[PDB]
Amino acid sequence: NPQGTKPNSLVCANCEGEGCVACSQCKGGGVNLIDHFNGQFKAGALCWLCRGKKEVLCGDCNGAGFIGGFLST
Amino acid sequence: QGTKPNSLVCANCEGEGCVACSQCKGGGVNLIDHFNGQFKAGALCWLCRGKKEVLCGDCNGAGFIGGFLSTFD
Amino acid sequence: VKDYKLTYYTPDYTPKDTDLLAAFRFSPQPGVPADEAGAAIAAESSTGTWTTVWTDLLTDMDRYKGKCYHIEPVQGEENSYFAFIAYPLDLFEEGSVTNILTSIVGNVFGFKAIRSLRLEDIRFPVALVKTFQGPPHGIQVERDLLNKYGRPMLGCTIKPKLGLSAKNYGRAVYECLRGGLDFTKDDENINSQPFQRWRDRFLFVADAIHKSQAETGEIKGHYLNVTAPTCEEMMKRAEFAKELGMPIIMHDFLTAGFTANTTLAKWCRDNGVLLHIHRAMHAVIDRQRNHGIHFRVLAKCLRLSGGDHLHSGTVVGKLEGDKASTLGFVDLMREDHIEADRSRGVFFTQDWASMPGVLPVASGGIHVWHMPALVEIFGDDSVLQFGGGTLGHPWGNAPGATANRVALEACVQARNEGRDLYREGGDILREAGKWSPELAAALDLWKEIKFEF
Amino acid sequence: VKDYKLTYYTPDYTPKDTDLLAAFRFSPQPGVPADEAGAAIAAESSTGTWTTVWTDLLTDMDRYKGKCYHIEPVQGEENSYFAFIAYPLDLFEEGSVTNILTSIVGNVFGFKAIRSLRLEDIRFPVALVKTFQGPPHGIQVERDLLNKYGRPMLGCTIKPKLGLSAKNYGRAVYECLRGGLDFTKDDENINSQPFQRWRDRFLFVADAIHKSQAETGEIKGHYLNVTAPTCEEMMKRAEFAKELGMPIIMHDFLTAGFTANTTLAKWCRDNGVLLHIHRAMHAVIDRQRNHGIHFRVLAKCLRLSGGDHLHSGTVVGKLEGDKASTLGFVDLMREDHIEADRSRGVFFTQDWASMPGVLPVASGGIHVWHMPALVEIFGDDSVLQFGGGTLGHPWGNAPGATANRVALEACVQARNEGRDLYREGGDILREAGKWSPELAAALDLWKEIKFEFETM
Amino acid sequence: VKDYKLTYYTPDYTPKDTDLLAAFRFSPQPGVPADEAGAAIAAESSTGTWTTVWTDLLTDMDRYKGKCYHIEPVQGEENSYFAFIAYPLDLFEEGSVTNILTSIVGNVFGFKAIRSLRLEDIRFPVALVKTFQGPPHGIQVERDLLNKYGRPMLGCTIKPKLGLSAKNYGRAVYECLRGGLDFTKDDENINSQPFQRWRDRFLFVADAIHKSQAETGEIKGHYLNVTAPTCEEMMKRAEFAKELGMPIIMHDFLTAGFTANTTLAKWCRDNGVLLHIHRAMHAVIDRQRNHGIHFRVLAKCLRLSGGDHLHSGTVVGKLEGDKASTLGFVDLMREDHIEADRSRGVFFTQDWASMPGVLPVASGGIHVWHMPALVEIFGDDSVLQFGGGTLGHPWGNAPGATANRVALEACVQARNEGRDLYREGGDILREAGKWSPELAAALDLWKEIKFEFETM
Amino acid sequence: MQQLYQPFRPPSSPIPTQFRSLDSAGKIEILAGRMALWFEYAPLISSLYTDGFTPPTIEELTGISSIEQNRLIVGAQVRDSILQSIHEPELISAFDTGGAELLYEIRLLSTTQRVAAATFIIDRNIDSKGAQDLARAIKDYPNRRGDVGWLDFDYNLPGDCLSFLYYRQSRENKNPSDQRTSMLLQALGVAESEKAKNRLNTELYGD
C-alpha cells in the first residue's frame, strides 16, 4: 500500500498520483536500448515497451493514481 | 361595453366582477314582501339571500369585455 | 496534474439545480486524513480514478464524475465526519430507482481505507422527480375514494393467524370490521402455506367485507397480501383481488425488490387499486448508526417508485432527537416543500414538484390510553394499526372495535374544541367511558394511564 | 415463560431431518441472560408469545413454533454467543425465497433487548431443496454449451472507460474477443442512459461477437446487462438479446430483488441462455462482523433461486482467517455434500440432492503474476475477470488478451506435469515469456508479488 | 382589474427556472393600450378572468395563472409590441405536445381586441424536456449506423414523375443509388393510389436497394412514405417495411398530427429504424409576418416529439435578414446550449439537457454550382437533396449521381486544406471537372451564380 | 475485389518522400504495425482509398475504425497547412503524439488564421469543446458588421474574437443580475489587446 510522502489515502507512491509514469527503457528519443532476437524494436528508434510514447501506466496502481480499495483499474 | 381608452375593463362594475346586489342594494334584506310570499320583507333578500352581492351581468363576473374566453357572445 | 490537488475535493464549487446531492457520514482508518477520504468516496462511486490516463482518450470527461465539496465534522462524536457529494444528472436513467441505488451505493461501502460509512440523506432534482410515476393515488384522492374526512383511520392486525382455517379467518375479519374499524391487515408472513392457500382465503375475506359493508354502512377494507415468488404469480393474485372487487392490496418492497414494486405500482394506477407498503426486513440495513442506509432515504425512494401508505412506527416513547428525527421524515412524506433543518435530520432542501403524498401508519401494539398523543402528533392524515389493543378485550372482537372507535372520535372532538389532548387525555378518556361499557372495560384492562409529565 | 424453562429453550431436543435450522450470533444488552435472549429470538421469528393465551383455543399450538435447541459462547469474544434454533417445515411456501427471508429475518433484527444480531448460516432440508428450480444450466451443461474443457475461462470487464459511443464500445469488445479472451462484461452501472441507449449497444456488441467468433473458430460471449425498471422492460431486453443469438446475459440480484431474479431464471431455463449474477450493494448488508447477514446465506439463496456464475471475490490477498471462510463458501456452491467444519465457517451438514452447481468468478485488480496462485486455489471450474490487467497493455487491447491467454495456458500446462505452483510460479512465467513479446511486456509492466516465505 | 395593475402585468417579477416562457408579437385595435392587451393575452391563455369571483373559494388560484412580465415595442414597426409571459409547470401534462399546444395557443388567437398575434418563440424548462423521449437516434448514432463520416450526405427525390409503374420506379431508384448517391426520397403525394399501390412499391424498391448495396459496398436507403389514413394502416406499413430490412422511413408531421408522430417515433425507437420528417402544409401557418406561428416553435416541438431529419430549407438565395433567422433556428436543433441573441431570432436561452440533435435537410432546385456554398453554411452535419440537379443530366440517371458525388468530394477535400469556399468555389469546381466527363457536362448547362461581390 | 462502379474517384493521391516505392501490402504492414508517426502514415490511408479499398476493408485489415481514419487524414492535412507557413518549430515539435483531435476542430479556418488559432489553443491548454466554440466565434465575427463596439475588437487575434462573442452575449441582458457580470469577467479573462481591455473595463467597472 504505497503512500506518497506523509500518510494519506495511499496516493500511490510509485507515481505520486501521476497514474502514468516514465517508461523505464526509453531515453530521450523513445529509443530502445535493448537489443532482442525478434528485432522489431531491436534496431533503435522505437522503444520496445512504450513504442515511442515515453510513458506507461504505473504498475502499483494500474494508472488509478491511488490505492486503498481501488488498486483495481 | 368597456371604459373606452382602456377598452377591456368593464364599465358597469369597473373590474370588480362582483357588484352590490341591485335588489336589496347591499342591505341583504328584502325591501318588500313578495307576491308569492316565499320571500318576506326584512327577512332575507330574495336574490342574494343576504350575501349583499351578485355577479355583474355585463361581464358575468370576469371583468373582461370581449374576451374570447368568458362573455364572448 | 499531480494528485496533491486531488481534483475532486472542490471546496468552492457550488452545486447546480440539476445535480443529485448525497451526504455520507464516514469514519476513516487510523492514519488517513479526512479530505483524502472524501475525495476517495467521490471517486469510488464514479469512475474510480483520480487521474486522466483512461478517461482522457479523446478530450471527453470531467462531466461523468462526482466531486466532494464540503467535509465538516460531526459534533460530539470524534473521528467521524460528514461528506457532501454532487453527481451530474446524465449518469442516471429515467424511471429507474434500481439504477440510482446501484450507481450511488454500489461498491463504495466496500472501500478498504474507511472503517465505517453510512448514507444519511439525498436530494433529487425536480428534473429527475418529474420522470417517475409517484404514488398511484396520494392522500386527497384516497380520502375521496374511501369517503372518510376529519379523523385518522383505524385498522386492526389479526394476531392468531397461524393454523387458522380460511373460514374462521373470514369470521374474525367480519367481527372486527362490523364493530367499527376501517381496515384489517393480513399478517406479513402469510402467503400460500399448505395449511391455508391464497385463493381459499381471498374468497372468504371478500365475502365478509361485502356482508359488513352494507350493515355498517361504511366502506370497509382488508389488505390482501400479494407478495409472490414470481412476476406471474404476483399479477395473478392482483387480478383476482380486483375481480372480486377489493379496494386495497399489500406488498413488501424490501424482500421483493424495487423492480416488482414498480411493476405493481403501475398496475395499481391503471386499475384503480390502492397500495399499502409493508417494511419488513429493514433493521437488517438501518439499525446501527455506524453502517447502513438511514431509513429516510428508503422512504424517499419509495415515494418515488410508488405506494400509498407506509409503515413508520410509533413515536410515543422515543427519548428526543431520536424522536424529532422520526417526525422529520414524516414531513418528507406528506409535505411538498421541506426546508433544511439539521436538528430534525433533514440535510437538504427538497421540493417535490406537486407529486402526491404518502400516508404514515403507526403500529406496535398501542392501546386506548395512547389515543390522545397519537391524535395530536401524526394529525389526521394517518392510519392507526392496533394489535392486541383490539383482539384482547374481555368481551370479544366487536366490543374491542367499538371501544377503540369511541375513544378515537372522543379525542378528535375535544381536540376540535381546543382541549389539549396530552394534558387532558386521561380526563377525556374517563368522561367518554362513563356512558359506554366497552370503553370502561378497556380503560381498566389496560391499566397503563401513561402519565404525561 | 417463567423459571419454567420458557418452553422455547429445549436443550434435550434433537431436530428432525425436515426442519430448517438457523444459527445466529448475538450480543445482548447489559443485565440480560443468554438463555432468555435465545428463547426470545426464537419467539420473535414466529408467533411472538411465550404463553398460550392467543395460540391455544382447540389445537392451534406446538406446530408452528421455533424451538431453540442450542446456545454456546464464542471463543475469544466476551458477551457474544451462538444460538441454534430450528423451525418446522409447514411455515414456508413452496418455491419462494422471499417467504423464507421474510419469515426468518423479518422483524427479529429490531429486537430491543439484543445489542446486535448476525445470521451466520442456514440449512435447508432436502424436502425443501427439491421444490425450487435451481440454476438454469449448472456447471457441466454450461461447460458443454461453450466447449471449453480443462482450463478456467477468461474475461475482461470494460470498467474505467465511461461515456463511450456505442460503436467504439463494439470496437473495444471486438479487439478484446479477437485477441484470445472468452467473455466480456458490461459495466454494471450501464443501462439505457442518454449517452448510450440499450438497443444500440446490443446491436453493435452482437456484430462484434459474430465477426470475432467467425474469424477465430470458437465460441465467444458478452454479458449484456438486462437490469431494468420494470418486469416488462426487463423481459423485453431479454427477448431482444435472445433474438440476436446471444449466449449469456447479466443481472443484479440485490438491487432488483428476488422476485425479478426468479422470474428471469425461469425465462432463461425455458429459452436456453445462461445467467450471470453480479453481487452489487452487498457490503451494505455483510461487511461489519457484528450485524447483518453473512454472505454464505445469500450464496445459498442464490443457488436456490437461480444463476450460473456468481461473484465471490479473490483470496490472493487475505489471511487464513478469511481465506478459510471464502474457500468454505466456494465449496458450498460447487459440490453436492458438505460436511460440518467450523474452521471453514460451515456450521451444518448440507446435502444438495443432485442439484447443479454455480461457478465462481474471481475479479478485481489482478494481473499476470497472480495466475499461478488462482489456478490451483480456485481450480479449473472458475471464471477469471481481468479489469485493468488487460486494457492497459503498453500497446493495445488485443496484445493484452494474448498475453493473458499465454500466461494461463502456461500455468495450467505446467500444473498438469506435477510442478508446484507455489515454489515455481515466477520461473514458470519467465520461462514462458521468452518466445512471446506480449508476455514479456506484460511481465515487465507489473511486479512480482512473492506470496509468502515460499508457499501460500 | 382596474387602475390597480391588473394582477397579471407584474413587471417586477422574475421567472423561476421551472416556468414555460412565451413571447408573442401582437398588434392591437385602435384605442386600446399595450399593458391591457398584454394582461389580456395572459388571461386568455389560462383562467379567463382578471378578478377572483370564480377562482377563489378556499385556496385554488393564483397558482394556475399566467403572469405577464414584460412588454416592449418592436423597432421599426409602429403599433406593434412584444409581450413576454410566463406559465407555471403544473398546467401541462407529462409527455404530450398536444397539451402544450392547446394550452398556449388554444383560443387566444381569436381574441377580438387584438388585431393580429404571432408566437415567436418558447422556452421549455429542463424539468419538462426530460419527460419526452426525443429523437429516436439522433446525430451520432444515425451517423454510426450508416458509417458515413466527414462529408454531408446526398439524396435525390424523384419529384416530377407521377403515374409511373412500380417496376420503373424501382428501376430509377436503382440507377440513382448505384451511381453514387446515399438516399432517395418518395414524392410526398405518393400513397397507395390506384395506379401504384403501396405494397408493390415497397417490394420493388427493396429489391433495388439490395442489388445496389450488394454490388457497391456501402449502405443505401430510400425514404418510404408510411403516411396512412389510420393508426392501424400506418403501423401495418411500418411493420412490413421493417420486415424487408429497410433502414429509414418517412412521415408528414403536420397533416397527420402530433399523436401519430409520437406513436411512430416510439415504434421507431423500439424497432431501430430512423425517422425522416417532411414539413408539408407549413406555409399555411407561418408565412405572413403578422399572424400565425413562426417555424422555430414547430422545430422545437418536433425535436421534442421525435424525428431524426427535418426539412429546413436552403439559405443560398436569401439576405442576412432571413439567412440569420434560418441559421439561428438551425443551431436551435443541433447543439446543446443556445444563448439568447435577438439578431438570429433566439429570444430565450435554451438548454437541452443532453438530448440528441436532429439533422437539417436542404432541398429544392439546387445544382452543382451551389455545392461550395452549402458545404460551408450548413457545415457537414446535414443532408443535401437534389431534385432536378440529378435526374436531368444530359445522358442519364447514374451519370448525374456520379457528377454530384464528384463535386461534393472535391469541395470538402478542398475545404479541409484551408482554401476559401467563397473566393474559390468556381475554380475548385472547374479544376475538378477536368478528369471526369460527367462533371464537365454538368458544369456546362448549369450556370455559375456569383453569390455577391466576392463573398457571402 | 473491385467494388463495382465507383466513378467518383480522384486519379491518385500524394505519397510521402519515404514510401514512394512500396506496394499495397507494404502500406498494409506499416499501418498495422504503427511503424511511424500519425502524420507519416495518414497519407498512406488517404492513398489506399484510391486503389479500391473501402474504409470497412481498411478497418478489417489494419484495425482503425472509420472515424479515426477520417480524423487522422484531416488532422495531417491541417498540420501540413500549418507547417507550410510562418511559424516557429515548437508547436510542430508538440504535434507529434496526440494532436489529431485538436487539429480536427480548427479545419474550419483558412490557412491564414489557422496558425494564429493554434497558438491560442495550445497555450491555454484547451480541449475539443473550447476549440469548437473558438472556431465558431471566429467564423461568426465577420458577419456582425454593425453592432455595439465592434471595431474595438481586432480580427487578426483569436482572443479578441472570443472576447467579442462573450461581450455581445452579455450585453443581451440587463444590469448585473450576476449573469451579465459572469460573462463580462469571462470575456476579460481571454482578451489580449488593449482597446478590448479598456473597453471591457469601462463596461464592467465604472462609467
From Swiss-Prot, chain A:
Zn(2+) 2 binds at residues 23, 26, 47, 50. Disulfide bonds: none annotated. A zinc finger (CR-type) spans 2-73. Its main location: plastid. One of its GO terms (cellular component) is chloroplast. It is found in: Plastid, Chloroplast stroma. Coiled coil: none annotated. Zn(2+) 3 binds at residues 18, 20, 55. GO terms for molecular function: protein folding chaperone; zinc ion binding. One of its GO terms (biological process) is ribulose bisphosphate carboxylase complex assembly. The keyword Ribosomal protein does not apply. Zn(2+) 1 binds at residues 12, 15, 58, 61. Keywords: Chaperone, Chloroplast, Metal-binding, Plastid, Repeat, Transit peptide, Zinc, Zinc-finger. The keyword Zinc-finger applies. Chloroplast chaperone required for RuBisCo biogenesis and translational regulation of the RuBisCo large subunit (RbcL). Stabilizes an end-state assembly intermediate of eight RbcL subunits until the small subunits (RBCSs) become available to produce a complete stable RuBisCo complex containing eight small and eight large subunits. Interacts with the RuBisCo large subunit (RbcL) assembled as an intermediate complex made of eight RbcL and eight BSD2 subunits. Belongs to the BSD2 chaperone family. This is Protein BUNDLE SHEATH DEFECTIVE 2, chloroplastic. It comes from Arabidopsis thaliana.
From Swiss-Prot, chain C:
Its EC number is 4.1.1.39. One of its GO terms (molecular function) is magnesium ion binding. It catalyses: 2 (2R)-3-phosphoglycerate + 2 H(+) = D-ribulose 1,5-bisphosphate + CO2 + H2O; D-ribulose 1,5-bisphosphate + O2 = 2-phosphoglycolate + (2R)-3-phosphoglycerate + 2 H(+). One of its GO terms (biological process) is reductive pentose-phosphate cycle. SUPFAM superfamilies: RuBisCo, C-terminal domain, RuBisCO, large subunit, small (N-terminal) domain. This is Ribulose bisphosphate carboxylase large chain. Changing residue 113 to Y: Reduced formation of the RbcL8-(RbcX2)8 complex. Changing residue 36 to A/C: Does not form the RbcL8-(RbcX2)8 complex. A motif (Interacts with RbcX2) lies at residues 448-453. Its cofactor is Mg(2+). PANTHER family: RIBULOSE BISPHOSPHATE CARBOXYLASE, RIBULOSE BISPHOSPHATE CARBOXYLASE LARGE CHAIN. The active site is at residues 159, 278. Changing residue 40 to H: Wild-type formation of the RbcL8-(RbcX2)8 complex.
Swiss-Prot record, chain F:
Transmembrane segments: none annotated. Its main location: plastid. One of its GO terms (biological process) is ribulose bisphosphate carboxylase complex assembly. It is found in: Plastid, Chloroplast. The keyword Plastid applies. Residues 15-204 are annotated as: N-terminal alpha-helix. GO terms for cellular component: chloroplast; chloroplast stroma; cytosol. The keyword Chloroplast applies. Keywords: Chaperone, Chloroplast, Coiled coil, Plastid, Transit peptide. It comes from the Eukaryota. Homodimer. Has 3 domains, the N-terminal alpha-helical domain, an extended flexible linker and the C-terminal beta-sheet domain. The N-terminal alpha-helical domain stabilizes RbcL dimers and RbcL dimer-dimer interactions, facilitating RbcL(8) formation. The C-terminal beta-sheet domain probably dimerizes Raf1. The 2 C-terminal beta-sheet domains are swapped and pack against each other to form the dimer interface. Required for assembly or stability of RuBisCO. Acts at a postchaperonin step to fold and/or assemble the large subunit (rbcL) into RuBisCO. RAF1 brackets an rbcL dimer (rbcL(2)), leading to rbcL(8)-RAF1(4) complex formation. In the next step, RBCS displaces RAF1, thus resulting in holoenzyme formation. Belongs to the RAF family. This is Rubisco accumulation factor 1.2, chloroplastic. It comes from Arabidopsis thaliana (Mouse-ear cress). The chain holds residues 62 to 267 of 449 of the full protein.
